[PDB]
Structure 1
Amino acid sequence: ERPTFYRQELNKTIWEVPERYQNLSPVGSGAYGSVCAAFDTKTGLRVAVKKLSRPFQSIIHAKRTYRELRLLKHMKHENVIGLLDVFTPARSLEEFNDVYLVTHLMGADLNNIVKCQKLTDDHVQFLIYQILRGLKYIHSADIIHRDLKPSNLAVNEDCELKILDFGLTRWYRAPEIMLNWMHYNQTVDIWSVGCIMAELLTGRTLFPGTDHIDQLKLILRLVGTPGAELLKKISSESARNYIQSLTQMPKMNFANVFIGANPLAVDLLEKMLVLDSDKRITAAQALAHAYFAQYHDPDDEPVADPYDQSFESRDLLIDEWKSLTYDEVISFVPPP
């Protein structure tokens, strides 16, 4: 298009990006799009460039491509990853088959920090406060991260955090979303924050489950087996049958689990790691907790503008998802 694009082979795939993006070096992947660390000639900054993997080769991928670009273009928050640029080597909609997304390049994720260190309490407060500040904003647009974990929580140390793969791995998942979605809310992310926070304070994974049944066993040893009040609210027969079959376990006192931690941290952990999603603290409420008195500013915890996600209910053809994505690429304006 307007810039001159250059081709190269990175990993076992062809990358075709503009001349402003130089020295592309792989970082990592998954099953949705590998990322390269790059140098922005125009800004003099290091960027992260993601090439979407076969964006329009399936109905699930085509809608996922749209979803991701809509999510990225909408979210404008300090603790939430943001879109710097979006491009395609394609000059028209007929040749459109590749999507590239550009963000800032972060220094490290939360797995890296906990390996090379044993964090302090102010360190934990600032990290957790930032994650919560970002989730309040995400949750206000009616989006649940659903897969919050240390690998999608990244820092540009300093110690300034950004949440990565929000609206679309076992150790940080809410128990309700483990044993078939027996009704769920946004606090599904709060359970994950609890798991992350506990790991930041102890240096060890809270529940390192070897499988989906062992994961549940580990969760229940700390939080206890579901009580009378909770069991009554479970409509799924198979889920109730499963719960009823486990030997009764009491809920542990978190003061005897998190030995030496700030008492305010322990109180907060108890509020986040509650079995009942109905009783679990929210992002906005957690930001008001005393543990964050040094960081909390109710005038500096913004919410998101309204986000139209009616598209989520719509069943379209690959080429309709493609055209809709094509419009979001063309219409894009940098932050700057």
Structure 2
Amino acid sequence: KVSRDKDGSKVTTVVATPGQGPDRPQEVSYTDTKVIGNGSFGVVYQAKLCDSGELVAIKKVLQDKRFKNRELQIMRKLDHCNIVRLRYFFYSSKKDEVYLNLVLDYVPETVYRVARHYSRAKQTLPVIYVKLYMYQLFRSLAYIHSFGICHRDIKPQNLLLDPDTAVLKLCDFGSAKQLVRGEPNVSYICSRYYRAPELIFGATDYTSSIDVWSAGCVLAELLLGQPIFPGDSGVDQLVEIIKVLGTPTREQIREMNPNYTEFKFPQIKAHPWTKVFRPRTPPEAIALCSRLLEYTPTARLTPLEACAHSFFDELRDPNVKLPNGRDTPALFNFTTQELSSNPPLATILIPPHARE
């Protein structure tokens, strides 16, 4: 690194490799560096790029140079406008230790912080924001699932937001992995409340539909004003699930983890979904929640099928505007890659007033 002091302000200069494009490192300078987060894996800083002036996030993470970094491999491959961009990366130094640094988009808000304000004010988030945020999350999932990549930690904190533009960036791919059928996967990924039933059961043969379950939990949380399946333990989470979905059937238990077929379960009958939410809740939203929070993983909607759900129809009306008067983000510029899982769905996703 190189530390200048233009007008006393500390300036860092590093030869950083761009994320996308060809492997051609560049001299990059930034200042105004301050810590804005700490995780189990490292610290995340905020900084100002010394030329463009734009704000960025820098994620410092220790790198044992023995193996490649899985997060870096996935982040360089991804390029989607609902996923936090990897602008650059570089290495630095604690002693005799190498650190990998990821320079990413700075995004000022998160879904968690927006939902908590409304919750503290005893206020419900307007459904237009629920449609906007949910749609962009599912679109980001449809894009990464097309590549076989499972995020595995979908949670409201991980959904960044620009409140002016209403644009959602999915972030933290440190738990993401390309899921190969037949090969086993660690079962202790995903955070509380948003863990799929198969993950609570410790299943190692799970699929990308666990991201769809977590998304259904985030949708239900936005409608309810609080997490739908809370609990400090697996039993507590499972009971809150069983109180809604009813007790799982023998076949459904075999679709998550057969190794849990003979165990004893709380024997509660299915509470009808309409009685789970507030009375003025849109029925199309309740319908979508029911199609994502299904016991059998193969029965859950795909992210692309979710984007085409009737709940998001208001996003396709030509007259839709943001509450603050601006235009909605670009919700229809689907690449054929995004539509890989089902291209015929494009007749619904891309509306007649958005073609050429």
Fold similarity call, TM over 0.5: yes
CA distance in 2, matches of 1:39, 1:182: 42
Tell me which stretches of 4 or more aligned residues in structure 1 moved more than 4 Å.
232-235, 296-299
Distance 1:279 1:88, change over 3 A: same
Among candidates 143, 152, 162, match of residue 169 of structure 2 = 162
CA distance in 2, matches of 1:215, 1:37: 35
* Contact 2:80–2:143 (CA under 8 A) maintained in structure 1: yes
Among candidates 149, 154, 179, match of residue 148 of structure 1 = 154
* Contact 1:17–1:89 (CA under 8 A) maintained in structure 2: no
Equivalent position amino acid for 1:300 in 2: N
**SS of the counterpart of 1:148?**
coil
**SS of the counterpart of 2:42?**
coil
Q: What's the counterpart of residue 235 of structure 2?
A: 213
1:1-336 aligned within 5 A? 4-5=2-3, 18=14, 20-52=29-61, 54-56=62-64, 62-63=67-68, 66-89=69-92, 97-117=98-118, 118-158=124-164, 159-166=166-173, 167=176, 169-181=191-203, 183-233=205-255, 236-237=258-259, 239-242=260-263, 245-259=264-278, 260-295=280-315, 300-302=333-335, 304=337
TM-score by length of 1: 0.77
CA distance in 1, matches of 2:197, 2:236: 12
CA distance in 1, matches of 2:291, 2:257: 24
Q: Structure 2 unaligned runs (5+)?
A: 6-10, 15-27, 119-123, 178-190, 317-329, 339-356
CA distance in 1, matches of 2:331, 2:157: 28
Normalized per residue, which structure has more strand?
Answer: 2
* Contact 1:136–1:303 (CA under 8 A) maintained in structure 2: no
* Contact 2:92–2:101 (CA under 8 A) maintained in structure 1: no
Structure with the greater relative contact order (CA < 8 A, sep ≥ 6): 1 or 2? 1
Q: What's the counterpart of residue 309 of structure 1?
A: none
TM-score by length of 2: 0.73
CA distance in 2, matches of 1:51, 1:101: 7
Equivalent position amino acid for 2:171 in 1: L
* Contact 1:198–1:269 (CA under 8 A) maintained in structure 2: yes
Identity over aligned pairs, percent: 30
Distance 1:151 1:299, change over 3 A: closer
> Deviation per CA, 1:6-54, whole angstroms, max 9, x where unpaired?
69xxxxxxx97637211111111212221011111111111101111x2
Equivalent position amino acid for 1:111 in 2: Y
- 1:85 shift after superposition: 1.0
**SS of the counterpart of 1:73?**
helix
* Contact 1:138–1:304 (CA under 8 A) maintained in structure 2: no
* Contact 1:132–1:287 (CA under 8 A) maintained in structure 2: yes
**SS of the counterpart of 1:256?**
helix
> Deviation per CA, 1:257-280, whole angstroms, max 9, x where unpaired?
112211110000000111110111
**SS of the counterpart of 2:75?**
helix
Q: How many residue pairs end up in the alignment? A: 283
**SS of the counterpart of 1:38?**
strand
Q: Structure 1 unaligned runs (5+)?
A: 8-14, 306-336
Q: What's the counterpart of residue 322 of structure 1?
A: none
User: What is the RMSD of the two structures over their aligned residues, measured on CA atoms?
Assistant: 2.5
Equivalent position amino acid for 2:262 in 1: N
- 1:129 shift after superposition: 0.3
Distance 1:201 1:272, change over 3 A: same
CA distance in 2, matches of 1:172, 1:232: 21
> Deviation per CA, 1:153-193, whole angstroms, max 9, x where unpaired?
10122211000023163111101111121742211111111
Q: What's the counterpart of residue 352 of structure 2?
A: none
More divergent stretch after superposition (95-104 vs 269-278) = 95-104
